Design a protein around this ligand. Structure first.
Ligand SMILES: CC(C)CCC[C@@H](C)[C@H]1CC[C@H]2[C@@H]3CC=C4C[C@@H](OC(=O)CCC(=O)O)CC[C@]4(C)[C@H]3CC[C@]12C
Ligand SMILES: CC(C)CCC[C@@H](C)[C@H]1CC[C@H]2[C@@H]3CC=C4C[C@@H](OC(=O)CCC(=O)O)CC[C@]4(C)[C@H]3CC[C@]12C
Ligand SMILES: CCCCCCCCCCCCO[C@@H]1O[C@H](CO)[C@@H](O[C@H]2O[C@H](CO)[C@@H](O)[C@H](O)[C@H]2O)[C@H](O)[C@H]1O
Ligand SMILES: CCCCCCCCCCCCO[C@@H]1O[C@H](CO)[C@@H](O[C@H]2O[C@H](CO)[C@@H](O)[C@H](O)[C@H]2O)[C@H](O)[C@H]1O
Ligand SMILES: Nc1ncnc2c1ncn2[C@@H]1O[C@H](COP(=O)(O)OP(=O)(O)NP(=O)(O)O)[C@@H](O)[C@H]1O
Ligand SMILES: Nc1ncnc2c1ncn2[C@@H]1O[C@H](COP(=O)(O)OP(=O)(O)NP(=O)(O)O)[C@@H](O)[C@H]1O
Lengths: 560, 560
């Protein structure tokens, strides 16, 4: 019921179509359940006491039923369409709403949650939930209605035969359900054993380096063989129980029909059934049988849809631990570009036991180039993650012109901070689209504006030399670029963004000249914090900071 | 046909069961196809020209048909069992054979191929292939046989009615197949569009750090919304074509049955059909209809099984690029333990553009401790990978006592080399099983032997202090151990292996004493090559080698 209110509100914008489709479902079902009654009359017209006017009755009964079938098909076709489209619209709203919720979450969420799981929840689970309040809902509704009308029509056609069926079917159904539960137990045992053999395989294949190192390849093969030989043993037992069940179920189905023909055939003489009447009863009995299986499948899909529901309401109602677009914007006169780290303590969410910063204090002055030095893996790149507020420190404060960056709007704070990595991330778009990404509105930037920043970044030359120019598709699924080329597109993107604060992370001879010339134009008049591996940039940097054991161990000029 | 020879040979060990199951499939199908003929006789006994002895004929006809149904169910049950078990045995042989092929492959194969893909090929594709030569094969065989007998029985029951059905069904079927192809086109267009919207989502979710850095969260949401709004547009068009098809197909099905009742009903007077005869024809026509759908589904599963086949024959017929158990074994007098690297050039298979070793030359003398020094990420751990022959160098040679390690048996070469990592890999087994892993036969080692190596490795104390002692389950799915505890179990495993060559890769105060005391006992009388981060082990090492830019830049004693 509380989860049903969520599913009712989800189907609510399509209430108009779902009500129309249900109206068309009613018509299609009414025409469909009338068919065995009229088919029974056709059979009796030909085979009860055929008169000379039997062909005249048959012709109007068949032409009449043809028109009803054409009407029923049109009503069913309209139902399927309206039900499918309603689901499509619900899924569409779920997809846009889920993706919006996902992108609003903090980086820490993505650090723990797999991309594939988010994509599967956005593609599979969204489609399943939409289907459950539409396609599945109408399927179970139709099935529930046809069973009801069917049982009612069996008692109408022959109360005696219907009473007999209803005295045989429940005991047999109870026995079959008990057998069905025992069969499910043997299936779980086999599937749990299969999982165990697969877990062993996954562990040894995953750690094949250790298996090889000890020469245990043949030892693991024999170990795995024993686990899958056990699966086979359990599967044979499950196969025997399934064969005995299917045989008993099959025989029951055949003998029950044989009983109805016998019992019905011997009914004398006012409770007697004509061959057409017996055809009505059998058709209605077969419709109840189908409808029972329909309700069974409906429950199976309703449970799958509820399982998908829980996975989606989990992300749709999720609140990010770090603000998305909440905070204050500092004035043009209030913002100078001076940044300060004060006793910062931080460990990544994936590895909280491994500290990255242990009492990290650093003062980056406005308009001055600060060089960050240290060994590989010391945690220099983590400084840029905390400055852009991708994570909040466990202890300590990061301030901009005396104002805590936690009080400010992170979207605005990031618009004033730019970054040029050693290996920049470029999307599978055109060179122009990737450059336009810097602007607050990449749809507002003109072709002349993209060309201007490309000339300053010394990128215009190689870009024009490409067959499609600025429309040359880069990224992973695009044209392979050199480190220097990728960096100059990253400089062009940063130049168009025009940040006050710039963060640099540091190659042949030809590339490194045009890149450093463009980096010079980019660095000028900006607060620069560069993580260096080259002694050339440390030498001309305003101040140098050494990071050792998560703390600024040394501070001052290159010579000092 | 060439792939069919592979599927024939796969079913060949179970030829005896599959022939028995086919024999039982023949009986079950023969009894099943006889049922509409005898049911038609039951109907006529009651409703053609009912005599006073109609109940006597009906009783023996129903009791007779009951016995035949009981026989048919028993024959079908036996078939299902024999078919399922044959498949299970084929899948079992495929699983043991595929896992054997996987573990025999070189490390480079696992570096490029995902673990999950190997597991899915070992669980899903193995089960599918087995099903295709058994369960599916019998399903398509039964379906093919029932259609054949069905059509033959329709012509037997009424040649006139059968000719009419066969003059209506093919034109309608041709039209439906043309409609079915157009419907598949609109479905592909929608599913290709869905893939595109998902690819965009996957790329932006995967690179959420870049999306946030430029404040393009709202920009990507709007970009994705446009892609899924297009999916919805294409899905509505597909929904309209599907509704029009289902309506036309449904109507055809109903009107064809209505035509057969009409045509058949008006058949006069020697070609006339009794109500039972019409029931036979309709039942046989419904059996052909089911059988046509059965052959359709059989082809669908045969193609899926052939697709699975290709994925498996790819790994089963695969030859490892590096020898598995091929080579020569050096004599006890010929082997001293002296190792030499000569102008080794190597780059990992995943990143061949990034060189790790660039003219690497190192001489490790027998019984002497050699310390390897260098910065983090210089490629010191790669030395152990090439020494254990997990990869072969692109240029250069690795020799043992003047003999090229490429000529020797890698399984034997690895039995003489042991390794103790900083973070050792322990399987989710007991402490004793993990220690026993060192021995050439972990089933041969006694409890006294595991206790002896545990006492020497200073591990016996904490192991006995555990609730289950040596039977304490460690690894990922087990009891959490400290770095020192894990290292002492790794020393116990190495002590039991008893290698001539030992490779060490380098922590509080209490752990580091008992670990270094155990490492001392382990190092003694062995050729040791240690990658150090601690100045204590470099100081007492026989010779020190410095690795810078993939080459031994410095060589000699700690003081020198
Ligand atoms: C009266 C109703 C409720 C049941 C009517 C069907 C029975 C007569 C069927 C159902 C399951 C059948 C059994 C399914 C499986 C087997 C295993 C089969 O054994 C083998 O093929 C030997 C090799 C092996 O088991 O691997 C022998 C027949 C038997 C007992 C079958 C005998 C006939 C049974 C009991
Ligand atoms: C004679 C045989 C071959 C076909 C018998 C069935 C037809 C009478 C059916 C099949 C598909 C039906 C159509 C399926 C979908 C629609 C869309 C439906 O439009 C809406 O519900 C408007 C909103 C929207 O399209 O989103 C109007 C009826 C119509 C044309 C249906 C009219 C009746 C059709 C043509
Ligand atoms: C199952 C077999 O069950 C058997 O069915 C027949 C036919 O309905 C019954 O036979 C008798 O009762 C039924 C029901 O009152 C009458 O329609 C029938 O004419 C009469 O012969 C038997 O009493 C019953 O034992
Ligand atoms: C579909 C309607 O098709 C119509 O079927 C009826 C009944 O079979 C045919 O009617 C006539 O021919 C058939 C076949 O020779 C005879 O069994 C029937 O007694 C006769 O009235 C019409 O000639 C045909 O046009
Ligand atoms: N998101 C993360 N979650 C967990 N651990 C991480 C994460 N990012 C980085 N690390 C680890 O933290 C270590 C140091 O942090 P990092 O900021 O990457 O260093 P660095 O100074 O940039 N080193 P380098 O790779 O030479 O440039 C890395 O080597 C990783 O093992
Ligand atoms: N299987 C592999 N495929 C591709 N690249 C790899 C592989 N293994 C390691 N690398 C890379 O090679 C680099 C150096 O090799 P490696 O042998 O790991 O170094 P190291 O001296 O052990 N450094 P460290 O991590 O401090 O101990 C690593 O930092 C990885 O980026």
């Amino acid at each position: 019921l509380p989860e049903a209110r969520k599913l009712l509100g989800l189907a609510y914008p399509e209430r108009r179509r779902l009500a129309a489709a249900v109206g068309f479902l009613t018509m299609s079902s009414v025409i469909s359940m009338s068919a065995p009654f009229f088919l029974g009359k056709i059979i009796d017209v030909i085979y009860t006491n055929p008169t000379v006017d039997y062909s005249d009755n048959l012709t109007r009964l068949c032409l009449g039923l043809s028109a009803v079938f054409l009407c029923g098909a049109a009503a069913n076709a309209i139902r399927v369409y309206l039900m499918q489209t309603s689901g499509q619209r619900i899924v569409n709203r779920l997809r846009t709403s889920l993706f919006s919720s996902i992108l609003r979450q903090e980086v820490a969420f993505f650090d723990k949650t797999r991309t594939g799981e988010l994509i599967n929840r956005l593609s599979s689970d969204t489609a399943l939930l939409g289907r459950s309040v539409t396609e599945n809902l109408s399927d179970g509704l139709r099935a529930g209605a046809q069973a009801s009308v069917g049982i009612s029509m069996m008692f109408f056609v022959s109360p005696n035969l219907a009473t007999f069926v209803l005295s045989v079917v429940p005991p047999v159904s109870i026995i079959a359900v008990i057998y069905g539960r025992y069969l499910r137990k043997l299936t779980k045992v086999t599937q749990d054993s299969l999982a165990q053999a697969t877990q062993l395989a996954e562990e040894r294949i995953g750690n094949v380096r250790t298996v090889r190192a000890f020469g245990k390849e043949m030892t693991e093969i024999e170990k795995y063989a024993s686990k899958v030989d056990h699966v086979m043993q359990l599967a044979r037992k499950e196969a025997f129980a399934r064969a005995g069940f299917f045989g008993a179920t099959g025989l029951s189905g055949n003998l029950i029909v044989l009983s109805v023909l016998y019992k019905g055939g011997l009914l004398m003489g006012s409770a007697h059934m004509t061959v057409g009447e017996l055809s009505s009863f059998l058709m209605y009995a077969f419709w109840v049988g189908i409808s029972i299986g329909g309700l069974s499948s409906f429950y199976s899909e309703l449970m799958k849809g509820l399982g998908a529901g829980g996975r989606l309401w989990e992300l749709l109602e999720r609140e990010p631990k770090l603000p998305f677009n909440e905070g204050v914007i500092l004035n043009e006169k209030s913002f100078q570009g001076a940044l300060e780290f004060k006793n910062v303590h931080f460990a990544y969410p994936a590895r909280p036991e491994v500290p990255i910063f242990q009492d990290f204090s650093l003062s980056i002055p406005s308009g001055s180039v600060t060089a960050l030095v240290g060994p590989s893996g010391s945690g220099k790149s983590t400084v840029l993650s905390l400055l852009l507020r991708l994570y909040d420190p466990a202890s300590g404060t990061i301030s901009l012109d005396g104002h805590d960056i936690r009080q400010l709007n992170p979207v605005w704070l990031r618009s004033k901070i730019g970054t040029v990595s050693q290996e920049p991330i470029l999307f599978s778009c055109s060179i122009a689209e990737n450059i336009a990404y810097g602007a607050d509105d990449p749809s507002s930037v003109t072709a002349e504006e993209i060309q201007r920043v490309a000339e300053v970044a010394n990128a215009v030359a190689f870009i024009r030399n490409f067959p499609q120019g600025f429309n040359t598709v880069v990224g992973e699924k695009g044209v392979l670029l050199s480190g220097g080329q990728k960096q100059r597109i990253a400089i062009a993107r940063a130049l168009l963004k025009n940040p006050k604060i710039l963060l640099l992370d540091e190659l042949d001879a030809e590339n490194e000249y045009l890149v450093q010339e463009a980096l010079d134009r980019l660095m000028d008049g900006r607060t620069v914090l560069v993580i260096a591996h080259h002694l050339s940039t440390i030498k001309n940097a305003n101040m140098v900071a050494v990071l050792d054991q998560g703390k600024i161990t040394e501070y001052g000029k290159h010579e000092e």
